[PDB]
Amino acid sequence: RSNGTVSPSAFLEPFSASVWVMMFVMLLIVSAIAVFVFEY
């Protein structure tokens, strides 16, 4: 086991599984609320 350690990194673990969807939809909701507020 000397050729390569191959230590896991951040990208090795799953990324943007389900939290990123929640952040994206909350960002969209906030943007829609801002547009509605600016409209009035």
Partner 1 sequence: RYQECLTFENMAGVFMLVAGGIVAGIFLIFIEIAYKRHK
The least distance separating partner 1 from the CB of residue 33, rounded to whole angstroms, comes to 5
Q: Work out whether 32 is an interface residue with partner 1 (CB under 8 A).
A: no
Q: Work out whether 33 is an interface residue with partner 1 (CB under 8 A).
A: yes
Residue of the chain from 23, 28, 35, 39 that contacts partner 1 (CB under 8 A): 23
Distance of CA 13 to the CA centre of its chain: 14
| DSSP calls for 1-40 | --S------TTTS--SSSHHHHHHHHHHHHHHHHHHHHH-
The least distance separating partner 1 from the CB of residue 9, rounded to whole angstroms, comes to 17
